[PDB]
Structure formats: C-alpha cells, structure tokens
Design a protein around this ligand. Structure first.
Ligand SMILES: O=C(O)c1ccc(-c2ccccc2)cc1O
Ligand SMILES: [Zn+2]
Length: 299
C-alpha cells in the first residue's frame, strides 16, 4: 500500500520569523498514525498545540496563520509545502515563538532538513482526498478551483504590472507525475517590493525580511546580488505557497488545483468550501503503491 509517513529522527533548526523578525527554534518530531501535522508553542506554559487543519486558520493577510484563541503560529505554508512535497502525514512541529522560521524564503532548507533526518513509513494506509466534481471559489478577479484529475497537478497565474514582471513567465503548470517538487518548486523564494516595505512594517509584516531570505524588487530590478534561481521563480513560489496552504486539508489530494491570482485567504476559502461540499470528494487509499496515480520518493 501507499503508507503514511513521519520523520525517522528529530530535526532541529534556528531562524527568524519573516513577519515578526523574532528568533525561533524549530523542532520536527515523529508522530503516530492519523496525528496529522500538529504545531506546538513550547515557549508557552502550559504548551499549546494547534493542529494544521483548515478550521484552525485564523488570519490570511500575507501568510497562513494558525490561531487557537490568542495563541498564533504564523507562516506555516512553506514548511507544510515541504511536508506535502515529501508525503509527511504525521509530525509534531515545536516552535519557541509565534512564527515558523523563514530560512532562505523557500522550502529548500525544509526538504533538505527532512530528507537528512529521513522519512519513516508507518503501518497505516495513506488517505487521499480525491476530487469527484469541480469546486471553485471566486472573489473579484481572484479564483481558486479544484477539478477531477487522476494524479496531482497545480496550475497558477499571477499578474503584476511591474517592470521586473514584464515579459517574464507569470503562468506555470506542474504535473507531479512528470516533475520533481524538490527540483522545480521547493527552491522558489518569497518575493517582496521596496515600494511596500514602509507600509508592511507599519502592519508588523516583513519585519524579518531582507535579501538573505527574500527576493527584493525595486523600480526596475531584483536587488539580490545573485539574481533569480528560476526565470519563473515568482509564479513557482505562488505554486509552493498553494501546495502549503492546501495541505491544511489534512491529507494529500488526487485532483488538479488552478489558482488565478489566489492567495492564502482564497486558498483557505476553497478548502472550507470543499470540506462543506461532501458530494465533490471521497477518501481513497492505494493498496499497491506501484499501480497508484501518484508516487513519493523512497523514504
Ligand atoms: O513578502 C515578503 O516575502 C517580503 C520579503 C521582503 C520584503 C522586503 C524586505 C526588505 C526591503 C524591501 C522589501 C518585503 C516582503 O513583502
Ligand atoms: Zn510564500
């Protein structure tokens, strides 16, 4: 069968919150079958757990924030993108502060840390949500949709009227049967604009942001001295963000997601509409990993 996965070993990392600028210690720990991904604020006494489920998303301004009352875990989406990409079902994520560390602004450091510690296959079938019917949410000129697809594919379009985006790829499709999440999505970095930073900092956003963890765009150029990792890095990062936001479903998807200028808010609205629309999906398992329409890397 396709088996549930957790970590083989405890993983530790240090960094700072993109939005808070706060130093934070991150610990990834194995968890039992059917735990899901559960975040834990170990700086609080008592410790507070918040499961990484759509119902616990409380703010979607410029990241996906898990909230339980006054307790927040901000910017979960890059780490959840890495776990979706590697097929991690079950993990405890301990944080000493209210925000996941940004690392280099991508999922690269997370996929590296997880594959270094290794994956553990668990003796329980991995459960997928298979899309049986179209489910779409729109708001103004933004759209997010699921459609039936025998596999997992993401299509995304952005549309920035900024000179740095002019002539540059603003649409991409990634079929995970034919493309590596690690090689083609994980290393795409968060990007920000100089023209925004004064307003964003007034909102306690991007307080930890710099060229060390973000692509910074000025009037007519990328400021990062080493430039882009991909010509299409911006749209590849929105695909990374979508895979992380959509992993708050709690299970991997069998279907296609298309995003049209959609961000954390509409992605979460699409999850909530899908969960309510039970005739549009079913849970499926695969008794033979070799015959399944999706494959994960050897653990
Ligand atoms: O969203 C982000 O990821 C982000 C990152 C960095 C900056 C930033 C940092 C320093 C100067 C200018 C912009 C702004 C941002 O919105
Ligand atoms: Zn992001």
């Amino acid at each position: 069968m396709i088996k549930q996965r957790t970590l083989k070993n405890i993983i530790r990392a240090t960094g700072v919150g993109l939005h808070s600028g706060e130093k934070v210690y991150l610990t990834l720990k194995p968890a039992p079958v059917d735990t899901g991904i559960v975040f834990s604020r170990t700086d609080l006494d008592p410790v507070v757990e918040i499961p990484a489920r759509a119902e616990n998303v409380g703010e979607t301004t410029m990241s996906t924030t898990l909230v339980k009352g006054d307790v927040k875990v901000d910017t979960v989406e890059h780490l959840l993108s890495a776990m979706a990409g590697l097929g991690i079902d079950n993990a405890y994520v301990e944080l000493s502060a209210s925000e996941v560390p940004i690392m280099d602004g991508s999922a690269g450091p997370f996929v590296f840390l997880i594959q270094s510690a290794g994956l553990q296959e668990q003796e329980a079938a991995k459960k997928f949500i298979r899309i049986k019917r179209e489910v779409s949410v729109e708001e103004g000129d933004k759209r997010a949709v699921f459609v039936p697809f025998d596999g997992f594919k993401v299509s995304f379009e952005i549309d920035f009227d900024h000179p740095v985006f002019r002539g540059r790829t603003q649409q991409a499709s990634v079929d995970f049967s034919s493309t590596s999440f690690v090689k083609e999505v994980s290393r795409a970095r968060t990007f920000g604009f100089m023209r925004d930073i004064e307003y964003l900092r007034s909102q306690n956003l991007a307080l930890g942001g710099s060229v060390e963890n973000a692509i910074v765009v000025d009037e007519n150029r990328v400021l990062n001295e080493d430039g882009l990792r991909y010509e299409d890095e911006f749209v590849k990062h929105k695909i990374l963000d979508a895979i992380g936001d959509l992993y708050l479903l709690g299970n991997s998807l069998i279907g296609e997601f298309r995003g049209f200028k959609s961000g954390h808010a509409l992605n979460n609205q699409l999850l909530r509409t899908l969960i309510a629309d039970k005739d549009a999906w079913e849970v499926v398992t695969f008794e033979d990993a070799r015959t399944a329409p999706i494959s994960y890397m050897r653990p």
